[PDB]
Design a binder for these strands. Structure first.
Lengths: 151, 76, 56, 91, 117
RNA sequence: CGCGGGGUGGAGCAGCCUGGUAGCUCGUCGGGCUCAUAACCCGAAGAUCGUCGGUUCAAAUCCGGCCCCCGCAACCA
RNA sequence: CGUCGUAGUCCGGAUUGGAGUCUGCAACUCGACUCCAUGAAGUCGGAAUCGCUAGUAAUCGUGGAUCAGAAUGCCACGGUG
RNA sequence: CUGCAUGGCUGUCGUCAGCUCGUGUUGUGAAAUGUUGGGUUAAGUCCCGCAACGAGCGCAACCCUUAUCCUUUGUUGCCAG
RNA sequence: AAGGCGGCCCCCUGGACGAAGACUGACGCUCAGGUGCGAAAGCGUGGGGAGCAAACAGGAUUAGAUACCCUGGUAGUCCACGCCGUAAACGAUGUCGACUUGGAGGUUGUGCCCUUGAGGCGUGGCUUCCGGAGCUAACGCGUUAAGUCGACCGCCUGGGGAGUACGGCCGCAAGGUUAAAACUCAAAUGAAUUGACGGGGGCCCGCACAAGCGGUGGAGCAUGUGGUUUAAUUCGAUGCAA
């Protein structure tokens, strides 16, 4: 990206709900190009989350994502022999991506029996803004507010 | 040497000794912190492994400065 | 750079004003300039160099 | 307690350079550390018959006042030989 | 225990640290908090975020008097010049005036040598 | 029978009067940095804390013996 | 579709015993593979470090050269992605 | 045996954008300019500018393959009626 | 004049420049020797001492670290009166005079124009950036010459040895000034050119970093190498490029 700027591939929407957002999610959860088996785990987790937690499947997703979404972050930088930490205000599209990514990662780093149950309980926790993924947003802010001076 | 103080303390309850040696008894960390605050002093965990942990009310900065002073002077 | 917020002006706008008053006033530049001793020969050297660059 | 600090004495470290850092090595010992001499030969498992035990031995012999050495090691391990030096032990 | 409702936020923002002090018009200290003593050291201590929680922690050791309006006095060039001010305003504070009071000698004392790092 | 200070990992220490998994340096073996080496940096190995009896919840640190090193001491023509 | 239900396990396959197959005058040193039994370390790897910008990475099988026999290497193929 | 006597082959910086010549002109001369600049390109790619005007090797093109279609040919491939 | 000179006010004082006309009548230029001035550091006596800071102490870094960084800190940096007389004391360009095309500015006098606008037309002093001829090894200089000429002075004669030794003069000292030879080498040097290189600089590229996904470093096995072993463990490949 020295010279060549680019657009971004605009992936197809989630097959079940027609959501580009959930397509960004299944892909992020996907491993070894196992798309078939990835969306299976995302839905069953949404189905587990939907059925027994007040429904509104897309909305349930947002309530949880709303909580792990980070408004600002820090970008490392090396000036006069010094590695300064510059807090940057982060753009909406990626805001979702980090939010989704930390939810997925916290799910695999969990004790429950399957990825679907884990994913479901991560969303639930995030929905109540608690657990690992939310905590990942908070460290980002503690780390950001600290270097507030250099913005 | 270094002691953890004030909010760094994790103990639920501590045995409290004030700045003059008065044994205040077993207090919740919250109450111990209140007593230290009203006296404009610090709550210092002087005996982390005692049962319950022992805290002393004192000015931590003044204490630490004097300790370092002592060490330096005796070696120069 | 003294600032006084006017009524029904958001805290942000007033702040942006303040930061531009200091950008205008040269505070941080000034503080940077004095953090460390500069030899007279050195500031004469700086002065020529910027005269020179200030030809396009 | 007694710490381990260290000094080195490479080959080509003679009087000049040397006893200046025998002064440095006093300093280590005299903090109350166990000052470990490391030789670092231009050499081998037997580099020298010269490099080490002029230096080391004269470091002991000059510092002998304040410090003594634990061992005069003369078993090199690698291309470098630790002579270990301590405070002179009160009997 | 007492009442003010009208204060001034003096923030000392050096490069290594940023000390926040809340006070009345007279200049009498009502409360204070620092970044270095809010759980931040060295590389993190000297950040705008550390100055922010300093401003936050300070607003908790002062509302015993129930301040409701204040002026801000920004001193020094470090971070937390600005981010400190923000946290104050979000903590429930009406900002009346902002003033930079960073001292500028009319060329008096010779400063320390340049650091050859 | 005669004083001093110590015993912890290969060597030297810290953890001591403030009794709850013994950590900190040089070496050891790896990894990183370099065209390469020195130097430096990330790291892992490495222990009945001398040895016993007492004493205790658990004693590295708690006492006293056995024992060892050094300290000066004693042999200082 | 069913089972195992977070365990050093219905994970993992090292190692070793026993008995065999085929190539080849000949499988002790040293071949490949099979049957039965065995069931190591390993519960995600310090400092440090590599590849990859799209039908790529990742993952899944497939074939070939050499070659009596001896591929986890090498060269090539497409599947999902 | 010598790759420190060699041919041929190969790695490598690196498919990086470089390497040069004639005539002109500048400098006593070694040399320079061209190929010092402003933009832009994967690129010494291209364009303006220019005491240079032009040219050659390398860049690109011509080559293989892949993506759409047309004509020819239907067996061992094909099966719309 | 050079060294160098910066808050404001007064006092004492040097130089420069312009306008107009009067006066003196070549009274001028240069200058070995001589005299005076001359940054900083340094020296002597007595003051002064906030900040800074040789030395020195302590903390760190490092293989070492008598350093670079940090915490301190004495002389010194400041004043008076003396000394020293040196700097990349530089425009690395001696002083004075005459002559030779131009453009854009800065600064500072002065004559003129409905002052009718913060201007319009001239005429001196200083100054900055380009550039013409000419000059120059080139770089560059170019009416403030490194051009074209003249007057006088200082200085150079290959590198090292050496601005050293000896002698003289000078200084409280540190030291300064004048200034050799033996010996040794075939070079030393200047400017510019093509590369290469840069953790000197500028601009720019590459999965180079950054953004990501999956790994190697741990384990067991396959495999290559080193090492070690052996009668032999055949020969070669060894930083990226074994």
């Amino acid at each position: 990206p020295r010279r060549r700027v680019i657009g971004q591939r605009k992936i197809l929407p989630d097959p079940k709900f027609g959501s580009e957002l959930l397509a960004k999610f299944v892909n992020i959860l996907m491993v070894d190009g196992k798309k078939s088996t990835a969306e299976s785990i995302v839905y069953s987790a949404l189905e587990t989350l939907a059925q027994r937690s007040g429904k509104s499947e897309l909305e349930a997703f947002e309530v949880a994502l709303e909580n792990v979404r980070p408004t600002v972050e820090v970008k490392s930088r090396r000036v006069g022999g010094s590695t300064y930490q510059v807090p940057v205000e982060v753009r909406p599209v990626r805001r979702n991506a980090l939010a989704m990514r930390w939810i997925v990662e916290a799910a695999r780093k969990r004790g429950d029996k399957s990825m679907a149950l884990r994913l479901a309980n991560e969303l639930s926790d995030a929905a109540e803004n608690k657990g690992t993924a939310v905590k990942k947003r908070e460290d980002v802010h503690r780390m950001a507010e600290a270097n507030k001076a250099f913005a | 040497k270094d002691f953890i103080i004030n909010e760094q303390i994790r103990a639920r309850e501590v045995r409290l000794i004030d700045q003059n040696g008065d044994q205040l008894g077993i207090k919740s960390k919250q109450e111990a912190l209140e007593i230290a605050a009203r006296r404009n002093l610090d709550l210092v965990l002087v005996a982390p492994n005692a049962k319950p942990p022992v805290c002393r009310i004192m000015d931590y900065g003044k204490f630490r400065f004097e300790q370092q002073k002592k060490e330096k002077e005796a070696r120069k | 750079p003294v600032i006084k917020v006017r009524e029904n002006e958001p805290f942000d706008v007033a702040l942006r004003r303040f930061k531009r008053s200091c950008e205008k006033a040269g505070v941080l530049a000034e503080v940077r300039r004095r953090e460390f001793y500069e030899k007279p020969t050195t500031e004469r050297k700086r002065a020529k160099a910027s005269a020179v660059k200030r030809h396009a | 307690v007694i710490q381990v600090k260290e000094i080195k004495f490479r080959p080509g470290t003679d009087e000049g350079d040397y006893q200046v850092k025998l002064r440095s090595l006093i300093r280590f010992l005299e903090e109350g550390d166990k000052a470990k001499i490391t030789l670092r030969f231009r050499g081998r498992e037997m580099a020298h018959q010269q490099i080490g035990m002029e230096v080391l031995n004269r470091v002991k012999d000059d510092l002998q006042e304040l410090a003594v050495v634990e061992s005069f090691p003369t078993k090199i391990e690698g291309r470098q030989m630790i002579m270990v030096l301590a405070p002179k032990k009160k009997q | 225990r007492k009442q003010v409702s009208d204060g001034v936020a003096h923030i000392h923002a050096s490069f290594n640290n940023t000390i926040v002090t809340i006070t009345d018009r007279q200049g009498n200290a009502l409360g204070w908090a620092t970044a270095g003593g809010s759980g931040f050291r060295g590389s993190r201590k000297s950040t705008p975020f550390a100055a922010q929680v300093a401003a936050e922690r300070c607003a908790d050791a002062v509302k015993e008097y129930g301040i409701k309006n204040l002026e801000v006095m920004v001193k020094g060039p470090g971070p937390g010049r600005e981010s400190t001010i923000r946290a104050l305003n979000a903590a429930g504070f009406r900002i009346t005036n902002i003033t930079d009071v960073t001292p500028i000698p009319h060329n008096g004392c010779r400063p320390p040598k340049k650091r050859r790092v």
